[PDB]
Design an enzyme around this catalytic site. Sequence first.
Site, PDB file in Angstrom:
ATOM      1  N   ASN A 109     -11.385  21.169 -29.285  1.00 38.13           N
ATOM      2  CA  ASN A 109     -10.755  19.997 -29.503  1.00 38.13           C
ATOM      3  C   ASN A 109      -9.465  20.116 -29.571  1.00 38.13           C
ATOM      4  O   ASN A 109      -8.700  20.840 -28.847  1.00 38.13           O
ATOM      5  CB  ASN A 109     -11.431  19.551 -30.983  1.00 38.13           C
ATOM      6  CG  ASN A 109     -11.223  20.521 -31.863  1.00 38.13           C
ATOM      7  OD1 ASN A 109      -9.784  21.453 -31.825  1.00 38.13           O
ATOM      8  ND2 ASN A 109     -12.046  21.058 -32.928  1.00 38.13           N
ATOM      9  N   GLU A 149     -36.091  13.914 -50.739  1.00 39.41           N
ATOM     10  CA  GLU A 149     -36.436  13.055 -52.302  1.00 39.41           C
ATOM     11  C   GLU A 149     -35.508  12.810 -52.976  1.00 39.41           C
ATOM     12  O   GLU A 149     -35.220  12.041 -53.756  1.00 39.41           O
ATOM     13  CB  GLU A 149     -37.874  13.718 -52.821  1.00 39.41           C
ATOM     14  CG  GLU A 149     -39.153  13.587 -51.810  1.00 39.41           C
ATOM     15  CD  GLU A 149     -39.494  12.188 -51.553  1.00 39.41           C
ATOM     16  OE1 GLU A 149     -39.009  11.304 -52.252  1.00 39.41           O
ATOM     17  OE2 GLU A 149     -40.372  12.194 -50.295  1.00 39.41           O
ATOM     18  N   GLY A 160     -11.018  26.966 -47.823  1.00 41.40           N
ATOM     19  CA  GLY A 160     -10.489  28.080 -47.227  1.00 41.40           C
ATOM     20  C   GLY A 160     -10.987  28.083 -45.722  1.00 41.40           C
ATOM     21  O   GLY A 160     -11.609  27.509 -45.180  1.00 41.40           O
ATOM     22  N   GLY A 198     -14.495  37.230 -22.755  1.00 42.77           N
ATOM     23  CA  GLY A 198     -15.421  38.550 -22.876  1.00 42.77           C
ATOM     24  C   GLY A 198     -16.024  39.136 -21.583  1.00 42.77           C
ATOM     25  O   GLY A 198     -15.480  38.998 -20.487  1.00 42.77           O
TER      26      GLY A 198
END
Length: 469
Positions: free
Chosen positions: A341, A175, A253, A368
């Site tokens: 990217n 709204e 930052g 990992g």
Amino acid sequence: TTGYDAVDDLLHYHERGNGIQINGKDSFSNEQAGLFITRENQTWNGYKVFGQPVKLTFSFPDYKFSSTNVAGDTGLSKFSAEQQQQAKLSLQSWADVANITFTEVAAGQKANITFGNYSQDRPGHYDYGTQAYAFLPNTIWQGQDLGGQTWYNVNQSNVKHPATEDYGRQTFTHEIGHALGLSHPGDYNAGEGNPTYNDVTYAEDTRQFSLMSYWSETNTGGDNGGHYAAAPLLDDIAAIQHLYGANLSTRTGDTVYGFNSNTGRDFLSTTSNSQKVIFAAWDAGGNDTFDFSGYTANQRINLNEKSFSDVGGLKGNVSIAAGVTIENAIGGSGNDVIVGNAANNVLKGGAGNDVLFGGGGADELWGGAGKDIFVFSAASDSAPGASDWIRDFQKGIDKIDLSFFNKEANSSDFIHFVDHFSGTAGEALLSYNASSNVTDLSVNIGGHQAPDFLVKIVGQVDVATDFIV
Ligand SMILES: CCCCCCCC
Ligand SMILES: CCCCCCCC
Ligand SMILES: CCCCCC
Ligand SMILES: CCCCCC
Ligand SMILES: [Ca+2]
Ligand SMILES: [Ca+2]
Ligand SMILES: [Ca+2]
Ligand SMILES: [Ca+2]
Ligand SMILES: [Ca+2]
Ligand SMILES: [Ca+2]
Ligand SMILES: [Ca+2]
Ligand SMILES: [Zn+2]
């Protein structure tokens, strides 16, 4: 499926614009959607006055119960403390993305944007049917500008308790959207008072793309898990930045989104697997991270502008606004697909069997634990002088996927391993330094004596087991 297949599928997720059709409807680009959402061309700076900053006041008037508002509703009341708190967070979420300043004024003072509750459609008769409404800027009625008035049906629990019922918070943001100049993304004329998603003007009129929409994200293949976005979504950002310009001061930052967040925004943060994020990220500078480490679901994270990610067990729930560069991503304990990217990216798979794709720039890749796959599809992915590093490679367990190249060449004998270079395009050469624990993978893609692709790998690599070619 190869690692490359998974990367290719994520890169082509929610393709849009350029005249294509989806669900039998025209697809609009992010830009086209922003323009269509703002098709009334009304702003606080004037009709068809776009791109300029604005300073607006807001208040919570002390409406009298027996009074009647401009729309004929009554049983009015002032926003509660909880409602005020949530409304301020909704206001802030618009101010984060566009050049809008909001300043609270006293309940009795004239204000540009107001919030009120109503409960009755006529005196003594409670309304359980409606939700909320608002007036766009420059809505002139009996000589007076109604623009900025927002009204909510406090009989609805979500309106009364927006801090615990996320549709209430979304409704506030929606709204306020109207109060700023945004419309619903369609008029739905063909629905004649009983509209459905089938009456949209463009395919991306769903809650996946805009919280100005009432249509489920499932119409476009999203799945928000029963939750509702708190803050402006991808096409809402395009819309409001068209109206008032992009906020170049926001989060300039180094910003962490998701787990371990330093955003100071509820809708950009989580502290548990059960707390699911839904957001479109606007960020105007710095080295930033999508930290989705605390989720157990299989996730898909795309760091490209305007792209969608599947985060925390939801689908198409996280996106990056146009013009924004997010640098780093951290997966969770699930089996993830993580696509970078053109910038230097740090990509971390975490536990699970992950697929990592750095793309352009000099990337730092950590599989990992688990059986991870590191995917490459251009020499420029890892150019000499700007090599990717795979920091945690385990022979016999992890893999390097070069399969794009032979698929493109339509030849099983284009990429092949040799013990010395001859200048022949396709030659790949491994060199192992046992003293430094570094393996070099060099490939001559373009056909020169000097290779045009070099990946640096911490760990041994076994050519017999560790490639997909
Ligand atoms: C064809 C896309 C149109 C978006 C601009 C708004 C048109 C009223
Ligand atoms: C009830 C008349 C108010 C003005 C309506 C215009 C906004 C839809
Ligand atoms: C149903 C009342 C809506 C007023 C704003 C269009
Ligand atoms: C005012 C348009 C609402 C559409 C929801 C069915
Ligand atoms: Ca930042
Ligand atoms: Ca950045
Ligand atoms: Ca993982
Ligand atoms: Ca990259
Ligand atoms: Ca892993
Ligand atoms: Ca691994
Ligand atoms: Ca790279
Ligand atoms: Zn609306």
